[PDB]
Amino acid sequence: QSNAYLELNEIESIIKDINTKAQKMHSGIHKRFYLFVALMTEFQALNGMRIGEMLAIQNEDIDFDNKSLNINGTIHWFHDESGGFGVKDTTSSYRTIGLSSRSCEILKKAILENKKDSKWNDGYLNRNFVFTNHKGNPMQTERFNKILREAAKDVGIDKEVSSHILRHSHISLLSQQGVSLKAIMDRVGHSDHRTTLSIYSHVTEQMDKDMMNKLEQVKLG
Amino acid sequence: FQSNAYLELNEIESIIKDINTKAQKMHSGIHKRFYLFVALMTEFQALNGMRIGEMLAIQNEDIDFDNKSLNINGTIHWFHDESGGFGVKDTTKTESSYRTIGLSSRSCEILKKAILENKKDSKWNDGYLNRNFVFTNHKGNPMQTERFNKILREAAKDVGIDKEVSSHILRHSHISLLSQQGVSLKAIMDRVGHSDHRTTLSIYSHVTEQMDKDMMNKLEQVKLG
Numbered sequence: 001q002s003n004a005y006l007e008l009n010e011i012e013s014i015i016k017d018i019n020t021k022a023q024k025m026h027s028g029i030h031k032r033f034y035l036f037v038a039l040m041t042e043f044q045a046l047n048g049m050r051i052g053e054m055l056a057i058q059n060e061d062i063d064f065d066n067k068s069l070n071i072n073g074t075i076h077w078f079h080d081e082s083g084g085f086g087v088k089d090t091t092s093s094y095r096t097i098g099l100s101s102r103s104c105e106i107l108k109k110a111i112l113e114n115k116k117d118s119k120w121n122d123g124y125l126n127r128n129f130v131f132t133n134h135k136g137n138p139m140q141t142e143r144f145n146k147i148l149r150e151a152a153k154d155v156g157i158d159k160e161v162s163s164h165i166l167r168h169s170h171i172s173l174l175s176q177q178g179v180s181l182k183a184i185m186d187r188v189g190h191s192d193h194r195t196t197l198s199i200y201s202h203v204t205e206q207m208d209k210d211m212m213n214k215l216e217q218v219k220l221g
Numbered sequence: 222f223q224s225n226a227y228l229e230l231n232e233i234e235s236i237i238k239d240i241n242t243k244a245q246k247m248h249s250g251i252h253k254r255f256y257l258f259v260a261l262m263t264e265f266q267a268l269n270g271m272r273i274g275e276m277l278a279i280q281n282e283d284i285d286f287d288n289k290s291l292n293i294n295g296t297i298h299w300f301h302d303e304s305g306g307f308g309v310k311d312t313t314k315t316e317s318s319y320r321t322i323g324l325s326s327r328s329c330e331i332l333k334k335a336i337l338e339n340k341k342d343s344k345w346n347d348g349y350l351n352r353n354f355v356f357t358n359h360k361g362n363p364m365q366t367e368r369f370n371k372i373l374r375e376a377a378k379d380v381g382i383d384k385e386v387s388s389h390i391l392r393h394s395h396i397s398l399l400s401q402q403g404v405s406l407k408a409i410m411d412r413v414g415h416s417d418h419r420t421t422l423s424i425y426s427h428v429t430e431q432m433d434k435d436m437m438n439k440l441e442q443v444k445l446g
């Protein structure tokens with residue numbers, strides 16, 4: 001839609017709820033799921049990629065020195081020869097975007113958890129994915145979304161929620177910060193431009209309506 | 222098109238302050254009046270973005286203080302009317318940039334100040350020919366643009382601005398401000414009119430290009446856990 005996004009503070013509150021669930025948990029498997037969904041929720045709100053793209057991120061795709069991420073495939077959901085579930089497709093939404101410092105922490109945290117489980121948990125088959133379940137597979141979309149809805153509801157948000165709304169939220173954020181439609185698309189990808197353009201329009205129209213309000217603040221004498 | 226192409230808010234603020242400071246030091250009531258009015262005009266154009274000719278053509282009846290709006294319906298033509306008033310308001314339709322714009326409280330304040338001063342003069346000063354203009358000299362005429370520019374220039378010099386200045390830069394400054402506030406080009410255009418749109422366009426593009434470059438810098442402030 002046109003109003004199909006969340007406010008930063010709504011998302012913050014979602015992430016805090018999920019982290020809270022993560023902390024009460026005893027099962028390490030459940031803890032990892034909730035921990036990671038919290039990371040993924042923030043990451044997507046802060047970077048705007050599709051969920052399929054975020055699930056496909058691998059260690060080599062990140063460049064922490066230059067604070068950039070190379071987005072170059074999505075998940076195909078079938079088993080590879082090793083039993084691993086979910087395989088990366090390399091096969092033109094391909095792009096390189098910039099990572100904030102926060103986004104880098106998020107990635108480092110994911111990778112740290114992954115090094116540890118790789119090393120200590122026999123069931124964790126490292127295939128170099130970053131956002132993984134306890135088996136080292138890219139987390140399944142349906143699972144991420146389920147946890148996200150449940151949190152959103154628990155937190156009293158009324159809107160329907162899913163990974164899409166997070167991507168939309170990032171587009172809404174870039175709009176509010178005065179980024180141009182073209183720059184937003186370089187970052188978020190040229191796919192589904194109708195939706196992107198629809199959000200851009202809605203937001204920039206609110207900003208225009210706020211014009212006299214902002215000018216009210218300006219006194220020079 | 223450049224940073225020399227408009228003024229920062231604080232540069233405008235210094236200019237106004239310098240102009241008012243000069244006004245306070247003056248003996249001649251006529252000179253003090255010019256300076257006081259140049260200062261009001263400088264702020265008003267910076268806050269509103271009209272061309273100087275349109276600002277000079279503002280009359281009491283064009284202002285709607287209750288709805289905080291201004292009706293921009295004419296510009297000044299520099300010739301004498303049949304009573305000897307210099308500068309006449311032209312409202313011809315074809316040179317149409319006519320528009321209604323919103324005024325801020327400060328802009329309203331500014332207008333009320335100028336009008337109050339004109340009322341004093343209209344009542345006491347025999348040589349004030351009252352034609353309802355707001356931004357006037359002591360004869361009741363719309364102030365001449367060169368006398369505004371000359372004072373504006375000296376203010377800029379004295380305050381250390383090393384840009385080329387005239388009324389235009391104030392209009393450009395307003396456009397720059399609305400661009401930094403994330404106002405769409407369509408909205409800017411409705412407020413400031415379509416005249417010299419090549420310039421409006423180039424300012425908007427320059428600023429929006431700056432804002433795009435500042436993207437990562439802005440995002441660095443975003444943290445949600």
Ligand SMILES: [Cl-]
Nearest residue numbers: 105106109446
């Ligand atoms: Cl963290």
Ligand SMILES: [Cl-]
Nearest residue numbers: 133139140143
């Ligand atoms: Cl999963």
Ligand SMILES: [Cl-]
Nearest residue numbers: 221330331334
């Ligand atoms: Cl005042």
Ligand SMILES: [Cl-]
Nearest residue numbers: 358364365368
């Ligand atoms: Cl004059």
